[PDB]
Amino acid sequence: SIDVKYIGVKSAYVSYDVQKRTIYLNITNTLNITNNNYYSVEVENITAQVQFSKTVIGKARLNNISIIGPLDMKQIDYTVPTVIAEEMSYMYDFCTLISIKVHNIVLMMQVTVTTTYFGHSEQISQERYQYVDCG
Amino acid sequence: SIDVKYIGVKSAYVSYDVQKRTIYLNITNTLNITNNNYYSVEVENITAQVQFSKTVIGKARLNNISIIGPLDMKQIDYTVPTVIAEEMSYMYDFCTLISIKVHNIVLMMQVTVTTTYFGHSEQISQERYQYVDCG
Amino acid sequence: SIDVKYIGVKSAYVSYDVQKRTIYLNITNTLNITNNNYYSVEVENITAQVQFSKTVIGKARLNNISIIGPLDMKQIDYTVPTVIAEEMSYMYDFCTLISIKVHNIVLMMQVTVTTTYFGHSEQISQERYQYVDCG
């Protein structure tokens, strides 16, 4: 990939920015830019390409065959009991969180039992992330 | 891919931004841009391509075959009981969350038992994320 | 892909923005742009392409064959009982949330048992996300 950028606040090619309570006077700004970009990217020039798959079963005997793909989840248990018991008392809860299997971004590509692949595959993530903020 | 950007506030090619309580006076700004972009991208030039799949079964005997694709989820349990008991008492709850299997983004591509693929595949996420804010 | 941007507040090619309580006086701004973009993108030049799939079954004997595609979910259980008991007491709940299996964006593409694919596939997500905000 090319030119993948995370900029936290400000982006410019050229900047003349003036901020706070400043005096900016008699300034002469002159700019002459030549900025040309040429991209020949992810380009393919092929005579022949073959993705051949063949399965042959002769006079064979097959019994109890199990093929299982990735991410198989079996008998998973989450037990998260919350119990509050109070008498003659005071409870103050602020920003209290119980979080079970919380997901932000899930990117899945080519998750398979069998795969034949030719070419390009790409995953990009750019993120500003805050889970909890309080005061 | 090309030119994939996260910018937190401000984006320019040229910027002259004048912000707060400033004096900006007698300024001469002159600008002369040539900025040309040329893209030959994700381009393909091919004489032949073949995606061939063949299954032959002859005088075979087949019993108890299971083929199971990815992300099989079986007999999963979430148990999250919440109990409050009070007498002569005070509860103050502010911003209290119970969160089970919460998703933001799920992107799934070519999730299969079998795949034959030629060419380009792409996933992009760009994000400002905040789960909790309180005050 | 090309030029995929997330900008938090403002985007411009050339910007002369003046913000707050500022004096901007006698300013001379001159601009001369040439900015041409040329795109040859996802272009294909092919003489022959073949997607062949063949299944041949002769005098075979087949019994108990199961093919199961991805994301199979079986006997999943969610138990989230909430119980509040109060006498001579006070409950103040503000911004209290119980969230089970909540989804924002779910994108699924080419999710199948078997697939033969030629070309381009793409998923893009751009987002400002707040789950909870309160005060």
Author numbering:
A (entry chain A), B (entry chain B), C (entry chain C): 120 to 254
Give passages from the manuscript.
Here we used structure determination by cryogenic electron microscopy to show that residues 120–254 of the lysosomal type II transmembrane protein 106B (TMEM106B) also form amyloid filaments in human brains. The TMEM106B folds shared a similar five-layered ordered core comprising residues S120–G254 and contained 17 β-strands, each ranging between 3 and 15 residues.
Our best maps for filaments with folds I, II and III had resolutions of 2.6, 3.4 and 2.8 Å, and came from case 1 (sporadic Alzheimer’s disease), case 19 (MSA) and case 17 (MSA), respectively. Likewise, there is an extra density in front of the side chain of Y209 in fold I, but not in the other folds. Individuals with fold I were homozygous for T185 or S185, or heterozygous, indicating that fold I can accommodate a threonine or a serine at position 185. Owing to the compatibility of both residues with the glycosylation motif at N183, no differences in the associated glycan densities were observed. Filaments with fold I were more common than filaments with folds II or III.
